[PDB]
Design a protein around this ligand. Sequence first.
Ligand SMILES: O=C(O)Cc1cccc2ccccc12
Length: 154
Amino acid sequence: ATKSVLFVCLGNICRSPIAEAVFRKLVTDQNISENWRVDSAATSGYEIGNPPDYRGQSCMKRHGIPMSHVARQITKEDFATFDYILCMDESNLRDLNRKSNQVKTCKAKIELLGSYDPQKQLIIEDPYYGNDSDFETVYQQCVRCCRAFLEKAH
Ligand SMILES: O=C(O)Cc1cccc2ccccc12
């Protein structure tokens, strides 16, 4: 059976496209991309249609992680179709839980991506107002969390 994961942040231009790209690389490396549906989306509509933040794209290039994405807003359908919805921070979690209670079918388990970190860094902090080093921190956290999630989901 196909497995599926949706990574979510507020705008779907910084953290969530990086998480999605990291995870897709991990499954592709293990020959199992065809067994996974992997995507990312936004809780809000501010950035719909936009490519990832140029600073995040630069970071991904440096690390050889394939990334190609158009920002989109989460839909009611996503709650019915995804097995996991993994978000970045407490604001995202509060918003997603609100949305989940407005649909009839919520198949998805909604969790913080950082709850999977073996190094126990719960929040993947928003790098929007940060610098290149903050994007690097986000990348490194995503690697740790995505590896652990792939290994064993909650
Ligand atoms: O943000 C809201 O509460 C309304 C709302 C906006 C956009 C997508 C949604 C998906 C599921 C449930 C509600 C949703």
